[PDB]
Amino acid sequence: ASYHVGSFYNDNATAKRIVDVIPEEMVTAGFKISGVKDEKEFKSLWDSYKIDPSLVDALCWARLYGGAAIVAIINDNRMLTSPVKPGAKLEGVRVYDRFAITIEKRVTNARSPRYGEPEIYKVSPGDNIQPYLIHHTRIFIADGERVTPQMRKQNQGWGASVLNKSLIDAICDYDYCESLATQILRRKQQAVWKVKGLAEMCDDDDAQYAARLRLAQVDDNSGVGRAIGIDAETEEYDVLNSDISGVPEFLSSKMDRIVSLSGIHEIIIKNKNVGGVSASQNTALETFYKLVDRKREEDYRPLLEFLLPFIVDEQEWSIEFEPLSVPSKKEESEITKNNVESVTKAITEQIIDLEEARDTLRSIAPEFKLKDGN
Amino acid sequence: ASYHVGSFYNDNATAKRIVDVIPEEMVTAGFKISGVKDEKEFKSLWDSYKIDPSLVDALCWARLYGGAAIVAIINDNRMLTSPVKPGAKLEGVRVYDRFAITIEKRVTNARSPRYGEPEIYKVSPGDNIQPYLIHHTRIFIADGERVTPQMRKQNQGWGASVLNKSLIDAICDYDYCESLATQILRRKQQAVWKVKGLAEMCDDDDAQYAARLRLAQVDDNSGVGRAIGIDAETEEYDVLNSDISGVPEFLSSKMDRIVSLSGIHEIIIKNKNVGGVSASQNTALETFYKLVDRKREEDYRPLLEFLLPFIVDEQEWSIEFEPLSVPSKKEESEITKNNVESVTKAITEQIIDLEEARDTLRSIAPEFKLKDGN
Amino acid sequence: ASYHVGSFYNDNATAKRIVDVIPEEMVTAGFKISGVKDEKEFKSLWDSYKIDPSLVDALCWARLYGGAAIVAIINDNRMLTSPVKPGAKLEGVRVYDRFAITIEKRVTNARSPRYGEPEIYKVSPGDNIQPYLIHHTRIFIADGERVTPQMRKQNQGWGASVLNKSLIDAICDYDYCESLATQILRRKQQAVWKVKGLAEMCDDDDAQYAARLRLAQVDDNSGVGRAIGIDAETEEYDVLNSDISGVPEFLSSKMDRIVSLSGIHEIIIKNKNVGGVSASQNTALETFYKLVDRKREEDYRPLLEFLLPFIVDEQEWSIEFEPLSVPSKKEESEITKNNVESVTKAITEQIIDLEEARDTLRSIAPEFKLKDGN
Amino acid sequence: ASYHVGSFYNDNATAKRIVDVIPEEMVTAGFKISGVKDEKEFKSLWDSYKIDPSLVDALCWARLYGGAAIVAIINDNRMLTSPVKPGAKLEGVRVYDRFAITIEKRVTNARSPRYGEPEIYKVSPGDNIQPYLIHHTRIFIADGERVTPQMRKQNQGWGASVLNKSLIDAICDYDYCESLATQILRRKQQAVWKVKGLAEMCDDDDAQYAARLRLAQVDDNSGVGRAIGIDAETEEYDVLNSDISGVPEFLSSKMDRIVSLSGIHEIIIKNKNVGGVSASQNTALETFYKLVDRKREEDYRPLLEFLLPFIVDEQEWSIEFEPLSVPSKKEESEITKNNVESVTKAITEQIIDLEEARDTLRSIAPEFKLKDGN
């Protein structure tokens, strides 16, 4: 069964895939900043931090247990319980699961609209170290999928696991069906040896052992090209056989039910190609891309506006999600051709003269490297 | 069969998908405001408030429970029971379900068209805090699908749930059908053992235990390459076998009935591409987008003109929804080429000049990085 | 079923393929460094050290055993326990498995973010040599796939094996199914010989030996064009035959289950083209490349920024991975044509000059042999 | 069985193909050098050596036995036990198998990082000649596939055979299945002759010989257009027939299992064309090319950097692997057209004037022969 729903995660592989395919596919797409003077220093600082495996782990724990929290370490000399100040920087991030976070203090001031969230968070990392209190501005809380408000307050504000009992049992019964299919194959044919007066033999005596040894020895040497001899007055040899048919489609239907309840396309979970059509599964993968972007817009972004203000001193910035459908080299060159022809087809006597022209070609054509100029 | 809609929602997964696919995919499309001098500050404010998860949750509860109420809080100076006057008005927002809203005060002024609808609302969130009264202009009431006026006045002006009785039992009997299919698979064949004088053993005795242990041991050691021996005079061994055929078609028909009743097309509810066609799923997707566009135009907009007048201080503005169907990097580049060559064709015969061509190209080609000027 | 993962790995072939297809195909793709004045010396150093087989082996052991440690040795002047200072730092490298690494010293300095992780490592390669201690900065720890934090701290900070229990028994029962199929084929038909009074011969006597020799001799001399003669009064000859149907489909379903559990697509694990479609395998390959790209971005890079700062002395550099999908001689020539005609289109309107066009063309068209100069 | 796994190689043809298709396909592709003044003198010296059959044999022995070694003969007057000097040339190479190489001396100097490999190799060529000792810099060691470090040190640093027991038995059972199919075809129909009182005839007497001679003679003259006559009171003639069906697909499944375990595509091992699709197997052959290049990058290259430094006095050189997918004459000419048009389309007033233009057209267009000039 599920038990702590941790054993089910680290034992079965279907649950592993169902809970993991979304986070890294979501995070490896990448993002670009806008309104900033330049992004290469941002890129260098980002991969100098090299903190995204912790982000992936936090997202996975949020999807599995229903909630996860990440703590931000700031070089400010002030106490971590006191709130941050503008202009502070970041040097590291550490991740916790749902069971390591508990509520400590609550504020309900009428005039201040901040009421409705615990002011001070209490963390218990374990590993024989002292628990400590954290301000609400220091850390961030990651949540899973939405649940009813009654159940939401019943779980102390925590979400719900992605492995609900319907999916759990839909995954479970497939193994039972597979075992039944294996047993059905094993029991395809049975041979019965009828002997007159076989009940007179003493139990577990040398006569019975010799009889069953002879039976086994004759059983090994039988076959299509080999015959056996039996008595005609006291022995009978008959074979009862049963057919096997229709089980592959039954297992396919079970897998389709698992796919339907999971919410992910069959190409990603069954890892199968239909083979009956050339380029129709491109629509399938773009549908999967649509659903993963849909999931991203509600979960990945809050981490973005929680982390960017601590990393860049620029005033106003916006976040843009790059379309994760990356094109192939042939088309890439053709699109660069199209853009470079379009940016300069009539601008020779039109609005786009030099300085906006270079800026336009820099963005839509990242292939054309160019030093900073006008 | 199911009594509490919340338990059925957070227990089953199909109901969760049916409730959730529409609102979040609706909201993640986005929108653009027209008639405003510049758009960057609009996006800056929109992602500064970052209030879209509450909107998604309110829409989900409006769909599920049949009613929801979003509460808008402003930075006024007087009591929240009194009406409002123009101002910044935005620093936060909260949502509530149907069960926490109650009508307490009503007016019927014939001269003013405002009669026939309540003016003061009572909210009782619970959690050991005092309920507080709200003026009508401050908050908005979100409703689901239309019902007969008699039932509307019977339900205290609240809509019905999207999980109707027919949908409920159509979901319910699918699990019964799957359990029956598994049971049918389990009983494909049965082996019957007949013994003369087997009814004389006392129940729960040593002889019966030994007999059943022997039967089990013989059962585990049979198969294709193994044979068994029996006494010809007294006992017999026979096997009864059945067949399985047509069950996957029956289950597929049940799923088809569920799809027909739900109203969401198969690629969204089954996650199974047909595979027998190249590009016929374009029509399926566009039909889905027509459905979600109808739902958006009938439900999402009221929040838009309830919130936008409080956001911006402009006298006049309009809201229109873009085609949601997202193009990919290639064909959007082709569109950009066509647009840029078409706009320059009609401006060289001294019909139109550059000052309006700037905005005409900016509206349709955001890829072209343009600053503001001549 | 299998106890030791190493014995199962070096015994079976499917496990070998599952472990090995990802890391070596990942590494043989290669990479390119950016921000460096010239690239020839980079390749000269890279193939002078020729340390990629050790990287492949370390990745394979990280995948299999759940953990691996690569040891980097530098040309410093002091003891290897002390930290390092900038220098050439590269003359060799060696790798070790999970079983040869142990934690002995730990620090918990709260002020420094370096707490929570070990600083000195103990390696015990064996082979009758003294174990030696290593500073943290000298070596790197390679990990496999994520596990629950409770299990992570239970396993002394080591990951889990990629051969989970479900994958193990899915591999195991396939061989049982194949053996059952062979046994079923062997027993397609059986010939039964009945003789009156055949039970009166003493066991291991001359008469019995002669009888069985005669039976064998008659058995080897039968067929379509040969007949046998028996006594009508006493003995009889009968043949019992069965059928075989649906076994290949059952075996294919078992392979499909193995493919679904493994996570690698059929062309890589079955080496069997579908044959019923023209160019649908492009989507299969690109899905595989998406998977291996995710694996690369999550696992290969840490070695890259662990080793590259020790390789080059440049202050700033960046690492990006090319699209792995290799084009062939024709379409790459078409890409070169498009690139060369597009780059010359935007440099004739006095927008950009030759000094940067040189590098722009050099980055995208290595085929054009360019020296360095104006 | 396998025995010395040499008899299995030189008796069965499937093992022959599995172990041989990779080496010569890998080596006949060829390679070109870069950074050298000219390569035609290199080409002439290379085919003057004519040493590649020994390389193919060494690779085959490495793949089969798990390890092989090649010895380099140098014209230096110094003793072969002493290390080589820079500037020495090569005149011949000789190949040995795994059993002709043994370890003689080991060095473990702490300061020198060369420890970890035997300093002096002892070779025992046999053929009644005296074994001799070799320095480690003189020779090269070729290894097969990776194995666990415990097994690696258990086999004195030698790899593993490509014919593991799983592949061995997968190859073996196919022959058993073929023999069973032949027997099943042979036993398709049996005719039984029943005679009353046939047991009274004396054994091996003239009466029995005459009876069986008559039976055979009647058996030869039977047929569709021929009838036989039997007595009605003492003779019976009956025919028992069994059908054959489903065995070709069973053998096909066995071959597919062999293909899957082998790791090579079915087109190369089954030597079959699907016939249901025009140009889909081009993807199959390019996948095979991908895997053979993948195998090449880890095994062929070390011989390249072991042999090139002894053949060329040029300082710095690099190795490039030519794409083994060779195009057809029609496309070849079209690609030459494309390159010659691309190299000169805008360079008339651009960077590429004369001397880099000729060098560019020399490389990408080897068809255009040209004498050395500017």
- State whether residue C305 sits within 8 Å of chain A by CB: yes
Residue C29, helix vs strand vs coil: coil
Q: What is the residue whose two structure tokens read 């079976």?
A: C12
Which residue of B lies nearest to A284 if distances are taken between CA atoms?
Answer: B273
Nearest to residue B239, comparing CAs of B184, B188, B189, B187? B189
Which residue in B368, B357, B304, B302 sits closest to B333, CA to CA? B368
Instruction: Tell me which residue in D246, D281, D319 faces C244 most closely, judged by beta carbons.
Output: D246
Could you tell me whether strands D189-195 and D139-143 are parallel, antiparallel, or unpaired per DSSP bridges? unpaired
Contact A44, A67 (CB under 8 A): no
Helix/strand/coil for C223: strand
CB-based contact, A229 to chain B, within 8 Å? no
Q: Residue D199 contacts by C-beta under 8 Å, 6 or more apart in sequence?
A: C231, C233, C234
Phi, psi of B93 (to 5 degrees): -165, 150
The structure tokens listed for D177 are 């299945």
Put simply, the answer to whether D294 touches C28 (Cβ < 8 Å) is yes
- B241 token code pair: 């076998």
- Helix then strand then coil, in percent of chain D rounded to 5, is 45, 15, 40
d(CA A374, CA A359): 9
Name the residue type at position A157: G
Q: At B81, phi and psi to the nearest 5?
A: -75, -30
With beta carbons less than 8 A apart as the criterion, state whether D259 and D266 touch. yes
Q: How many other C-beta atoms are found inside a 10 Å radius of the C-beta of residue B146?
A: 11
What is d(CA D130, CA D128) in angstroms, rounded to the nearest whole number? 7
The experimental technique behind this entry is cryo-EM
Q: What amino acid occupies position B66?
A: G
Tell me the C-alpha distance between D222 and D228, whole Å.
Answer: 7
Cα separation, C13 vs D169, in Å, equals 12
Of A334, C284, A272, C323, which Cα lies nearest the Cα of D286? C284
**Which of D177, D183, D253 should one mutate to test binding to chain A, selecting the residue with the greatest count of A CBs within 10 A?**
D183
Q: Is A53 exposed, middle or buried (0-12, 13-18, 19+ CB in 10 A)?
A: middle
Q: Is there a contact between D122 and D134 (Cβ–Cβ < 8 Å)?
A: yes
Interface contact flag, A273 C284, Cβ < 8 Å: yes
D299 closest CA partner among A40, A97, C53: C53
How far off is chain C from D84, nearest CA to CA, in Å? 19
- The whole-angstrom separation of Cα B343 and Cα A351 is 12
- Rounded to whole angstroms, the Cα distance separating C65 from D346 reads 57
Q: Which residue has the tokens 């220091």?
A: A138
Residues in contact with A328: Cβ distance below 8 Å, sequence separation at least 6, in sequence order: C323, C325
Judge B/D contact: 3 or more CB pairs < 8 A: no
Assigned token pair, A307: 């982390």
DSSP helix/strand/coil, D288:
helix
Nearest Cα of chain A lies from the Cα of D221 at a distance, in angstroms, of: 26
> Helix/strand/coil (H, E, C) string of chain B?
CCCCHHHHHHHCCHHHHHHHHHHHHHHCCCCEEECCCCCHHHHHHHHHHCCHHHHHHHHHHHHHHCEEEEEEECCCCCCCCCCCCCCCCCCEEEEEEHHHEEEEECCCCCCCCCCCCCCEEEECCCCCCCCEEEEHHHCEEEECECCCHHHHHHCCCCCECCCCHHHHHHHHHHHHHHHHHHHHHHCCEEEEEECCCCCCCCCCCHHHHHHHHHHHHHHHCCECCEEEEEECCCCEEEEEECCCCCHHHHHHHHHHHHHHHHCCCHHHHCCCCCCCCCCCHHHHHHHHHHHHHHHHHHHHHHHHHHHHHHHCCCCCCEEECCCCCCCCHHHHHHHHHHHHHHHHHCCCCCCCCHHHHHHHHHHHCCCCCCCCCC
Nearest chain C CA: its distance from B225 CA (Å): 7
Instruction: Report which secondary-structure segment, H or E, holds C248.
Output: helix C247-262
Q: What is the DSSP letter of C345?
A: H
Q: Classify residue D278 by its DSSP letter.
A: S
What's the token pair of residue C47? Answer: 């193939």
Q: B70: which strand partners?
A: B95, B140
CA distance from start to end of chain B: 69
CA distance D115 to C91: 13
Q: How far apart are CA D171 and CA D13, in angstroms?
A: 10
Which residue in the block uniquely carries the two structure tokens 């954290």? A134
Q: Which of C143, C118, C116, C132 is nearest to C61 (CA)?
A: C143
User: What subunits make at least 3 CB pairs under 8 angstroms with C?
Assistant: A, B, D
Q: How many residues make up chain B in this entry? A: 374
Helix (H, G, I), strand (E, B) or coil at D11: helix
**What H or E segment, with its residue span, contains residue D106?**
strand D101-106
Q: Characterize B297-322 residue by residue with b for buried, 16 or more Cβ atoms within 10 angstroms of its Cβ, and e for exposed.
A: eebbeebeebbbeebeeeeeeeeebe
Nearest chain D Cα distance for residue A221, angstroms: 14
Q: Is B331 on the interface with A (CB under 8 A)?
A: no
How many whole angstroms separate alpha carbon C278 and alpha carbon A275?
A: 9
Residues of C in contact with A334 (CB under 8 A): 338
Which value, in Å, is the radius of gyration of the alpha carbons in chain B? 33
User: How many CA atoms are closer than 13 Å to the CA of D131, on its beta-carbon side?
Assistant: 13
Residues in Cβ contact with D321 at an 8 Å cutoff, skipping those fewer than 6 apart: D29, D31, D293, D296, D297
Separation of alpha carbons D297 and B40, rounded Å: 52
| Out of A150, A259, A351, closest to residue B272 by CB | A259
Nearest to B309 by CA among B24, B36, B30: B36
CA distance C184 to chain B (A): 7
How far out from the chain centre does Cα A239 lie? 50
In DSSP terms, B33 is beta-bridged to B319
How far apart CA C353 and CA C360 sit, in angstroms, is: 11
For residue C334, give the H/E element and its range: helix C329-345
Q: In what order do the strands lie in the sheet with D132-135?
A: D101-106, D118-123, D132-135
CB-based contact (8 Å) between A360 and chain C? no
The Cβ of residue A181 has, within 10 Å, a number of other Cβ atoms equal to 22
Q: How many CB atoms lie within 10 A of CB A122?
A: 15
Q: CB–CB of B224/B184 below 8 Å?
A: no
Burial of residue D343 (number of CB atoms within 10 Å: 0-12, 13-18, 19+): buried
Residues 186-215 of C with CB under 8 A from A: 186-199, 211-212, 215
d(CA C159, CA C148): 10
Count CA within 13 A, CB hemisphere, residue B310: 23
Selection from B135, B58, B144, B138 nearest residue B104 by Cα: B135
**Pair D101, D66: CB distance under 8 Å:** no
Residues, chain A, total? 374
> C94: helix, coil or strand?
strand
Query: Are D168 and D153 within 8 A, CB to CB?
Result: no
Secondary structure tally for chain C: helices H, strands E: 13, 11
CA distance D122 to D118: 10
Is C6 within 8 Å of D360 when comparing Cβ atoms? no
Can you tell me the distance from the alpha carbon of A272 to that of A279, in angstroms, rounded to the nearest whole number? 14
**In 3-state terms, what secondary structure has residue C5?**
helix
HEC sequence for D250-269: HHHHHHHHHHHHHCCCHHHH
Q: How far is CA A329 from the centre of its chain?
A: 28
Nearest CA in chain C to A62: C148
Contact A275 C280 (CB under 8 A): yes
Query: Which chain D residue has its CA at the smallest distance from A278's CA?
Result: D280
Closest CA to C77 of C87, C64, C68: C87
Looking from the CA of A90 toward its CB, the CA atoms found within 13 Å total 21
CB contact D333 to C (< 8 Å): no
Dihedral pair phi/psi, residue B355, rounded to 5°: -65, -35
Please, after which residues is chain C broken with C–N above 2.5 Å? Answer: none
What's the Cα-to-Cα distance from C108 to each of A358, C63, C114, C115, D370, rounded to whole Å? 52, 30, 8, 4, 71
Give SS3 for D115. Answer: coil
Contact criterion met (CB below 8 Å) for D280 and D186: no
Question: Dmax of chain C from CA atoms?
Answer: 113
Provide the token pair at C232: 């009508």
| Token reading at C153 | 């701290």
Report the alpha-carbon distance of residue B132 to residue B139 in Å, rounded: 13
Cα–Cα distance, C312 to A321 (Å, whole number): 33
Q: Is B179 exposed, middle or buried (0-12, 13-18, 19+ CB in 10 A)?
A: exposed
Q: Which residues of D touch A225 (CB under 8 A)?
A: 180, 183, 187
* DSSP collapsed to 3 states, chain A: CCCCCCHHHHHCHHHHHHHHHHHHHHHCCCEEEECCCCCHHHHHHHHHHCCHHHHHHHHHHHHHHCEEEEEEECCCCCCCCCCCCCCCCCCEEEEECHHHEEEEEECCCCCCCCCCCEEEEEECCCCCCCCEEEECCCEEEEECECCCHHHHHHCCCCCECCCCHHHHHHHHHHHHHHHHHHHHHHCCEEEEEEECCCCCCCCCCHHHHHHHHHHHHHHHCCECCEEEEEECCCEEEEEEECCCCCHHHHHHHHHHHHHHHHCCCHHHHCCCCCCCCCCCHHHHHHHHHHHHHHHHHHHHHHHHHHHHHHCCCCCCCEEEECCCCCCCHHHHHHHHHHHHHHHCCCCCCCCCCCHHHHHHHHHHCCCCCCCCCC
- DSSP-derived letter for residue D145 is B
Provide the chain D residues 112-131 that lie in CB contact (below 8 A) with chain C.
113, 116
- Token pair 């480690």 is found at D136
In chain D, residues with a C-beta closer than 8 Å to the C-beta of A244 are: none
Touch test A–B: 3 Cβ pairs or more under 8 Å: yes
Phi, psi angle pair for C32, to nearest 5°: -130, 140
Compute chain C's Rg from CA coordinates: 33
Residues B50, A305 contacting (CB under 8 angstroms) = yes
Name residues 32-71 of chain C within 8 A of D (Cβ).
43-44, 47, 50, 52-53, 56-57, 60
| H or E element, residue D105 | strand D101-106
Assess C223–D contact: CB distance below 8 Å, yes or no: yes
Tokens standing for residue C140: 């790197």
Question: Is the Cβ–Cβ distance between C109 and C115 less than 8 Å?
Answer: yes
Helix (H, G, I), strand (E, B) or coil at C130: coil
Q: Please tell me whether residue D248 adopts helix, strand or coil conformation.
A: helix
D180: closest CA of chain A, how far (Å)? 8
Checking DSSP bridges between strand C236-241 and strand D101-106, what pairing results, if any? unpaired
Alpha-carbon gap, residue B283 to B279, rounded angstroms: 8
Q: Are A339 and C341 in contact (CB under 8 A)?
A: no
